Paper text:
In the gene cluster containing the lin1839 gene, the lin1840 gene encodes a putative glycoside hydrolase family (GH) 3 β-glucosidase (BGL) (GenBank accession number: CAC97071.1). The structure showed that Lin1840r forms a dimer of identical subunits each composed of three domains. The active center of Lin1840r is located at the interface of domains 1 and 2 as in the cases of known GH3 BGLs.
In the Cel2 and Gen2 complex structures, electron densities of Glc moieties were also both observed at subsite +1. These Glc moieties were thought to be the non-reducing ends of Cel2 and Gen2 due to the orientation of the hydroxy group participating in the glycosidic linkage, suggesting that Cel2 or Gen2 binds to the enzyme non-productively. In the both complexes, Glc molecules were observed only in molecule A. This might be due to impurity in quite high concentrations of soaked substrates. In the Cel2 complex, Trp409 stacks on another Glc moiety unlike in the cases of the Sop3 and Gen2 complexes. Unlike Lam2, Arg572 effectively excludes Cel2 as a substrate. However, the distance between Arg572 and the 6-OH of the glucoside in thioCel2 is so close as to cause steric hindrance. Actually, Cel2 binds to Lin1840r in the non-productive form. Moreover, the structure of the Lin1840r-Cel2 complex was compared with that of the JMB19063-Cel5 complex, which contains Glc in subsite −1 and Cel2 outside subsite −1. This complex is the same as the Cel2 complex of Lin1840r in that subsites +1 and −1 are filled with separate molecules.
Residue numbers in the entry:
A (entry chain A), B (entry chain B): 1 to 724
Write the structure that this text describes.
């Protein structure tokens, strides 16, 4: 409907109606739910909610099905005075019912189209089950794998994170201006504004502190890129940002988000984060938390009651302008309008059961493709991999038969529909002998059974891994290791004198040095999702050729954290010309290098890259154009990730030794050759100075072209002269 | 001499003389050195230094003896045109020849007078060997025991560090206006400005980042306190501060240090730090490093040549004002004048050999007293300790006989003057059997020998520890554990049936859970210094009663780092009520609490504290006066450390759960009772706000009185009304 009618609605609502529009509730607090109706009464009472509240609530959080949605919406519109439909929001993080790989695995794909397709299928299915908004992409930069939520990020690089972030937004939303017509797309919500991934000591919800310059330089850019590509909502972070909880941080949300980034959509709290500013000790009570959060421009309170119970009194007493509430209500209403909810409140479902669009075989193939794009081949000594189809496999360990391969933040996907490792392998390999072990134990009886199975077979597939519940939200591990029983199992298996492949399933970087030394090959599958065992079978047999690269550094040990590729030089860098010396930046007990670096991954093919002659000089404001020829010099069809890095050698701020500024994944048949070009615009040469200006300074830059952050050729370009 | 004559001198110097005055060199680059003369000609060449340079250099670093000094000063004054004497500077960190405990141990004393005495004795001896300046106190706040330089800090609390920092300046300098008269006192140099202790991942020289507010709130206060108490010099830090190397950070050094803090003394670079701005990538070359470091107000270049080779040309070319040079030279000259070098360049030594004053028996008793004040008794189950003097001791471990007990940053003390644990013990206990083992091994032969000795005796003194070389500068450990062989050794000894005391020697917090659990008692000696063996024997026999408290948290494990008492609450604090719940700030694998907390330590006595009745309310600006009656309710004389903490319950910045604001160590005979009174000024109630103002806000505070950060009574005060 036309904008004047939306504004008219704000004009016609009562103050109590306006307040309640700023509240989000679980489905079972609404009349007409068709699930968990036993939780409805006790919880209404603890929250002190009444019908006057629920019958005017703005939004639903986490409906269970299309019928829950229809029931709740139909009943709500029977009783709602002005006919304002509810908006339905959910966590579709790496898939709906067809579960794709966890986001950290998707980072390892270095492939933008993989990420868009995952988001498109996610929306196809989520809208088919009645959802209007997804709380995705999660764009928190991560340098600390203790933190369980690393699995929701694309990793340690702001540029990769920005690019894949835009790809998710595009896949979820398509053309943002036609969400009222394209009802298989949905609104995306960028989360968590801001810098939540820097949680101190990897502890959930813990303190974050960094300088404003670093916040601009590294932590904000991906939120910004997704916002600029049209993301419809943003969600606040649980953490403090320079001492003030993000949720009531007026500088952050008013000046930066709404001012500098020009975000004019719904800002929704993280769960309870409005109330939690009290725990943080920056509001005395719910009246203060209400007041400050609305001043900061939080439009929608997720599952707490500060707004419903306190805004009236604040507005009446004059502590808070009613104008701030009207503008919140206007953003809520515009979102609903943008989704077409005033013409069709059932968003395509009322006369059209789209059950047929859920968990299709086409979708399952897309998920499998994504899994084979995302896996990272870490070791492969002796061309152990790929295995011949008639290889006799002893499949052993906790991930041999475990159905827990769908990953964390899988709110709607079902283990029964997933493919485990044994099942996947038996579709490909005629001879498999299996010994399941538990995640945290290694008994004598296990060792006897493993030993018998390995004696019978030719090669061991050792399937190790985390339970998903050891990561995700509030899954912080102080020591980023697997249970010790699993390292003991790898130690045991090695003694049996057969070639060993370790297939590792997990949601964070781990300490894998002992796994690498104990095996001939090591394949990092992360959690691939619904098609996990096929992903595994195809990569091990060579039907698919591994092509993923690490999007997060794998530490030598927990105590090396944080370690990351885009680090500062220091005043005393370790060099090959001084290694051995005492008075340089090093540790007495480990290398400075991570065990495996950013951008690293192996292949069954072999590539050779050649970069075209580059200029020696460049004007300010000018783009560098980088042309690269890649050839597959082996007999095996394969994909490689060409990566381009920049360094600013001398600047007014000590700048990182490398930053990624371009990537493309190139597919090549045996012997095929291709040329690709990259434009590094002058923004690729720019940075935030100590004054917080985005600047370009004349001087020397190095340009690194290669297939990891370590396997690069290097070139020099002197930037100077005039601008443009 | 008079100020006019100092100024006159600046006038009379040539440019080349002014430039060289800003250079500091090792003694063997000067004519007249009586040690390492073979190093002179080659290094003069590598540094491209001439006579015109060395004959006008401003300062000497690390002279080796009184005779090195005299010889160098005689020869230098022979050729120096205007007669400007050299100033001699040295690292007297925790003792000269009489070595005291390491600073982190002196932190655990909680005893201002212990710290002043150490510094007084340090100056007495250092001046006797011809030194004018010491590079102490080191006031870097530390939260990361991976960093080897934690040993040089007094720990994790800015208030303790501030207070103890003032005590050290007072002991070194006494009356700062009378350094030309008091020739047994010496100039103090505060180091390292600023925030060096926040090195990321505990890696030496590494990146430091934090918000400016945090910098003001926690990282700056100790440097400021020492500067306000009259410290004569300041030394720059190796790290970046907000992306700019401290050494050339003009905001840091001109605006904060000289401006806000009103420091008008010599600013000396850390070693090589002027040149190392090149490595950091904030200067292209030595000409830029020179200009930038001089713009920042660095007066004295430690052992690099940027100034010496580049200032002339920068000044002649108009890219640097000569007025900045003249400012630096005048500060150098004024420091010399403050030390009385213009009337007596040998600072009391020339006709007065003070050899007699070095390593006296009186000085040794003061170092032993500092040792018994500084040790911390961590465990003592079933009153194993004190031991009766007729107790039969099996003394075993790497620290049984090791002479390595003087600590890191012991530049002048000698192990041959030190008392080892065996020697110490044998002066007290008639029956000791000794089985030394190596630091990093445990052989079958060791175990047989250990088994025989423990069978013969009644109690085990298990002496465990670090080599001092595993810490100090560029001694970063990624995992804060002793070698595994030591933990094995503790496990083995526990099986032998006999009671075990572990005496631990070290320079950092370590993972000690496994030691606590394998022994009946645990005494943290750190590195007591020269008298270490007598320190250990007196505490174990109870001739001295343990009275130290932890000044730095002992983590549960490496991955808990950083953990510290003055932490923020977060939005989801783990409470006694919600423990076990998934969605709160916690780890899956360890407790939140460190293994031992700030302010914790045991005693052979038992104490009772009670706090006199406090006001419910306070005006803004008003001091809170806290009165505490402590009784010793045991038969054993001892000392308790009374600690007072404040918390700001609600604020415009999320504030820490506690901050230490007062402390006093009280000595009490059996049965004795005392009253101590504390004034918490309105400054104790103040903090830095998001706009970087020092403010006091109205509202609730909690006041905690007790004997650790955990063992406290709590009281509430509402601050409001008008301002005093
Ligand atoms: O230099 C950092 C480091 O200082 C060491 O001091 C040296 C000193 O520099 C040298 O001139 C003298 O001969 O010996 C000492 C070694 O005893 C100190 O020993 C280290 O602990 C500290 O980390
Ligand atoms: O479940 C809805 C939301 O709850 C928040 O608190 C979580 O941290 C988000 O990641 C999630 O999108
Ligand atoms: O109350 C804790 C709630 O917090 C949210 O952050 C979680 O994502 C929900 O699982 C949970 O119910
Ligand atoms: O509650 C927050 C959590 O959402 C759950 O429903 C998911 O299964 C978890 O993996 C995630 O960490
Ligand atoms: O690296 C050269 C010098 O650096 C200083 O910081 C160290 O303390 C010296 O021990 C060392 O010789
Ligand atoms: Mg540059
Ligand atoms: Mg307050």
């Amino acid at each position: 409907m036309e904008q004047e009618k939306v504004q008219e609605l704000v004009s016609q609502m009562t103050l109590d109606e306006k307040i309640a529009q700023c509240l989000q509730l679980s489905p079972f607090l609404f009349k007409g739910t068709n699930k968990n109706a036993e939780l409805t009464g006790p919880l209404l009472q603890e929250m002190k909610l009444t019908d006057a509240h629920t019958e005017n609530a703005g939004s639903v959080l986490g409906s269970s099905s299309a019928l829950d949605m229809i029931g709740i919406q139909e009943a709500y519109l029977k009783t709602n005075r002005l006919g304002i439909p509810l908006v339905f929001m959910a966590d579709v993080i790496h898939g709906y019912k067809t579960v794709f790989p966890i986001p950290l695995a998707l980072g390892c794909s270095f492939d933008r189209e993989t990420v868009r397709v995952m988001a498109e299928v996610s929306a196809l299915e989520a809208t088919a089950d009645g959802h209007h908004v997804t709380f995705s992409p999660m764009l928190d930069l991560v340098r600390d794998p203790r933190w369980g939520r690393v699995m929701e990020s694309t990793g340690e690089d702001p540029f990769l994170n920005s690019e894949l972030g835009k790809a998710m937004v595009d896949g979820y939303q398509g053309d943002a201006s036609k969400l009222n017509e394209n009802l298989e797309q949905m609104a995306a919500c960028v989360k968590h504004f801001a810098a939540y991934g820097a949680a101190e000591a990897g502890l959930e919800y813990n303190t974050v502190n960094m300088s404003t310059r670093e916040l601009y330089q590294n932590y904000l850019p991906a939120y910004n890129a997704a916002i600029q590509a049209g993301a419809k909502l943003v969600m606040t972070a649980f953490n403090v940002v320079d001492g003030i909880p993000a949720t009531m941080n007026k500088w952050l949300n008013r000046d930066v988000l709404r001012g500098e980034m020009e975000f004019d959509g719904v800002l929704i709290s993280a769960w309870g984060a409005v109330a939690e500013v009290i725990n943080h000790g920056t509001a005395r009570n719910p009246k203060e938390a209400a007041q400050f959060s609305m001043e900061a421009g939080v439009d929608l309170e997720m599952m707490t009651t500060c707004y419903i119970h306190e805004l009236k009194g604040l507005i009446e007493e004059g502590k808070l302008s009613e104008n701030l509430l009207d503008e919140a209500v206007l953003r809520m209403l515009n979102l609903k309008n943008d989704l077409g909810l005033f013409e069709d409140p059932y968003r395509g479902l009322k006369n059209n059961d789209r059950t047929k669009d859920i968990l299709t075989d086409e979708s399952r193939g897309k998920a499998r493709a994504a899994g084979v794009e995302s896996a990272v081949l870490l070791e492969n000594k002796s061309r152990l991999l790929p295995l011949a189809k008639e290889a006799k496999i002893a499949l052993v360990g906790p991930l041999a038969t475990s159905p827990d391969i769908l990953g964390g933040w899988n709110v709607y996907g079902e283990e029964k529909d997933g493919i485990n490792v044994e099942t996947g392998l038996r579709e490909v390999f005629e001879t498999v002998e299996v010994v399941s072990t538990e995640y945290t134990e290694l008994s004598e009886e296990d060792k006897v059974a493993v030993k018998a199975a390995v004696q019978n077979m030719d090669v061991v597939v050792l399937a190790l891994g985390e339970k998903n519940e050891w990561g995700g939200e509030a899954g912080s591990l102080a020591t980023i290791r697997l249970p010790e029983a699993q390292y003991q199992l790898a130690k045991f298996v090695q003694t049996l004198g057969k070639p060993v492949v370790i297939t590792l399933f997990n949601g964070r970087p781990l300490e894998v040095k002992e796994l690498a030394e104990s095996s001939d090959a090591l394949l990092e599958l992360w959690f691939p999702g619904t098609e996990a065992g096929r992903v595994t079978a195809d990569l091990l047999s060579g039907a698919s050729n591994p092509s993923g690269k690490l999007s997060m550094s794998f530490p030598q040990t927990t105590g090396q954290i944080p370690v990351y590729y885009n680090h500062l030089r220091t005043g005393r860098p370790q060099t090959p010309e001084n290694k051995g010396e005492r008075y340089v930046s090093h540790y007495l007990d480990i290398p400075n290098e991570p065990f495996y670096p950013f951008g690293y991954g192996k292949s069954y093919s072999e590539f050779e890259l050649k970069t075209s002659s580059l200029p020696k000089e460049l004007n300010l404001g000018e783009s560098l154009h980088v042309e690269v020829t890649i050839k597959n010099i082996s007999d095996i069809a394969g994909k490689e990730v060409i990566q381009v890095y920049l360094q600013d050698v001398t600047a007014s701020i000590s700048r990182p030794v490398k930053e990624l500024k371009a990537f493309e994944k190139v597919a090549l048949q045996a012997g095929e050759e291709k040329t690709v070009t990259f434009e590094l615009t002058s923004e690729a040469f720019s940075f935030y100075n100590h004054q917080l200006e985005k600047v370009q300074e004349p001087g020397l830059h190095r340009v690194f072209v290669g297939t990891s952050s370590e396997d690069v050729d290097v070139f020099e370009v002197e930037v100077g002269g005039y601008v443009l």
